[PDB]
Amino acid sequence: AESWKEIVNLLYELLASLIRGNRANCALFSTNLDWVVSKLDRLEASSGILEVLYCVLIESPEVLNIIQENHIKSIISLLDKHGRNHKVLDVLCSLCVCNGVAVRSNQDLITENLLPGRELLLQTNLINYVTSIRPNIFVG
Amino acid sequence: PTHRACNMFLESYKAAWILTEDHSFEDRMIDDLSKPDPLHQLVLHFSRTALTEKSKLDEDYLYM
Amino acid sequence: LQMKLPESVKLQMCNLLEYFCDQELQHRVESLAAFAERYVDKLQANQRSRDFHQDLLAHCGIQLEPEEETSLSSRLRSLLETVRLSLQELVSHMVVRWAQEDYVQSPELVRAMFSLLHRQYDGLGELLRALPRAYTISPSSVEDTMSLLECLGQIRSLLIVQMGPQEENLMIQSIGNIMNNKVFYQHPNLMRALGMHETVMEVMVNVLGPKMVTSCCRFLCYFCRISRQNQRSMFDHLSYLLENSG
Amino acid sequence: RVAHALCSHVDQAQLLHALEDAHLPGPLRAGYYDLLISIHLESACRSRRSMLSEYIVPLTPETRAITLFPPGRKGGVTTSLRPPHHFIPLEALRDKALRMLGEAVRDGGQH
């Protein structure tokens, strides 16, 4: 079983390496990919899945054209479940633009879903200076 | 305007007559040549880079 | 700013420098048009005093090379000297020299610098390209022209895309609508991107790359009908299109 | 959707403040400038540049006067016709920008 955990860990890396310079490798990735989003959202092996997903995302225009809302939501959910690794953002960037030209519809859906919550991200405001004094030395 | 069309024709004619000569490209090249990276050697290197590993090459004007 | 700096800074600087040269050419183009105007009227007057364009061209040719040259040939020679003719150019040369004395790293910057150097001293050639692309508008209309231009611009935007989401189709319908509107006519003289028509054709091919497609085909067909010469350009485009259809 | 993102937040005011603002993370400063340009937004600029590539000649006597002189040479009265931007702090943003460049040469003092 321990041996199995180690093997499981490597295999993902091999797949990513295999898909690294082949535009076509990007295509096998698409069907593999529906299956992949599902597998990808899983515990015990996050870096490998993330890398494979990233490769697929930057892999080809076709993969970008293909898309599942179920899939987008799942990815966003995975990102929320796991703290940002500078990785979730990378994945989002990957989803965006082919590019080429990014797909307005996909972009809009993803953007709304992430943005709508306002629970990302951080957020900023301007704030005047919260400020105070009292009089007296002491009272009480 | 009809006058506008006439003007356009006149312009085409001037351009037609206008090509002359005197280039000086040779002079500029000479200056660049006189002018440890190559003064132009850099240009040659740039050409090698554009390109390598590309599926196809597109008539970039600067190169040609 | 002659100050030594990180090179990328150099690329940004090169971009600004590039931006100016373009403004400068535009001025030259505008200048040619004015000279052409006045002289054209005087020439028309001479003709009145006593195909036609070809004859006029021949006369001009003899003058700057001769029939009815008149005193004005001296005037044309004078204008010609002016065209032949800057400080910006010298500055650009100095800039190129500084870039050279250092060794560029990163290709985009080098390419930019090189193209700039070329325009900067090759000159004239830029002028010829400019002459080829110049359209002259006569004192009338224009609002229609502006509208057509805006419509064309939207088309370009749709072309950049995106992957084509339909809304682009509605926009295309709107452009078709301007064409339906009759703004564009006197439009053979009016054409730009691969003719507005070939720009559109490229768009359609990428699109080929439904109802919108049919509309585009109709628009192309309509454009054809308009120019025999336009028809021939359309025809070369057409051979390409036929190949694509294959 | 970019306009909506801008409604975010960020904010026009936030962006103005950031531009006026000095210091902070390099990744952050660059990112902010980029975001503002994209959503401020530049897009219009890209469209304009594309239109701007060609040259359009107009026929108005004011336009007629133009012309250039050899004795003399200068940088920049244009008769060229470009569609008006559909469309911030426009001239105001511009003033702020002109100001920053000066601040910039000063910073771009030596060492």
Swiss-Prot record, chain A:
Subcellular location: Sarcoplasmic reticulum membrane
Post-translational modification: The N-terminus is blocked.
Effect of substituting residue 104 to C: Decreases threshold for channel activation by K(+), caffeine and 4-chloro-m-cresol. Decreases inhibition by Mg(2+)
Quaternary data: Homotetramer. Can also form heterotetramers with RYR2. Identified in a complex composed of RYR1, PDE4D, PKA, FKBP1A and protein phosphatase 1 (PP1). Repeated very high-level exercise decreases interaction with PDE4D and protein phosphatase 1 (PP1). Interacts with CALM; CALM with bound calcium inhibits the RYR1 channel activity. Interacts with S100A1. Interacts with FKBP1A; this stabilizes the closed conformation of the channel. Interacts with CACNA1S; interaction with CACNA1S is important for activation of the RYR1 channel. Interacts with CACNB1.
Further information: Binding of [3H]ryanodine indicates that the heterozygous channel is activated by Ca(2+) concentrations 4-fold lower than normal. Single-cell analysis of cotransfected cells shows a significantly increased resting cytoplasmic Ca(2+) level and a significantly reduced luminal Ca(2+) level.
Purpose of the protein: Cytosolic calcium-activated calcium channel that mediates the release of Ca(2+) from the sarcoplasmic reticulum into the cytosol and thereby plays a key role in triggering muscle contraction following depolarization of T-tubules. Repeated very high-level exercise increases the open probability of the channel and leads to Ca(2+) leaking into the cytoplasm. Can also mediate the release of Ca(2+) from intracellular stores in neurons, and may thereby promote prolonged Ca(2+) signaling in the brain. Required for normal embryonic development of muscle fibers and skeletal muscle.
Name of the molecule in the record: Ryanodine receptor 1
Organism of provenance: Oryctolagus cuniculus (Rabbit)
Lineage: Eukaryota, Metazoa, Chordata, Craniata, Vertebrata
Gene: RYR1
Span within the parent record: 512 to 651 of 5037
UniProtKB/Swiss-Prot annotation, chain D:
Signal peptide residue numbers: none
Subcellular location: Sarcoplasmic reticulum membrane
Tissue expression remark: Detected in skeletal muscle (at protein level). Fast- or slow-twitch skeletal muscle.
Top-level taxonomic group: Eukaryota
Post-translational modification: The N-terminus is blocked.
Family classification: Belongs to the ryanodine receptor (TC 1.A.3.1) family. RYR1 subfamily.
Function summary: Cytosolic calcium-activated calcium channel that mediates the release of Ca(2+) from the sarcoplasmic reticulum into the cytosol and thereby plays a key role in triggering muscle contraction following depolarization of T-tubules. Repeated very high-level exercise increases the open probability of the channel and leads to Ca(2+) leaking into the cytoplasm. Can also mediate the release of Ca(2+) from intracellular stores in neurons, and may thereby promote prolonged Ca(2+) signaling in the brain. Required for normal embryonic development of muscle fibers and skeletal muscle.
Subunit-level organization: Homotetramer. Can also form heterotetramers with RYR2. Identified in a complex composed of RYR1, PDE4D, PKA, FKBP1A and protein phosphatase 1 (PP1). Repeated very high-level exercise decreases interaction with PDE4D and protein phosphatase 1 (PP1). Interacts with CALM; CALM with bound calcium inhibits the RYR1 channel activity. Interacts with S100A1. Interacts with FKBP1A; this stabilizes the closed conformation of the channel. Interacts with CACNA1S; interaction with CACNA1S is important for activation of the RYR1 channel. Interacts with CACNB1.
More about this protein: Binding of [3H]ryanodine indicates that the heterozygous channel is activated by Ca(2+) concentrations 4-fold lower than normal. Single-cell analysis of cotransfected cells shows a significantly increased resting cytoplasmic Ca(2+) level and a significantly reduced luminal Ca(2+) level.
Domains (record comment): The calcium release channel activity resides in the C-terminal region while the remaining part of the protein constitutes the 'foot' structure spanning the junctional gap between the sarcoplasmic reticulum (SR) and the T-tubule. Pore opening is mediated via the cytoplasmic calcium-binding domains that mediate a small rotation of the channel-forming transmembrane regions that then leads to channel opening.
Protein name listed in UniProt: Ryanodine receptor 1
This protein's encoding gene: RYR1
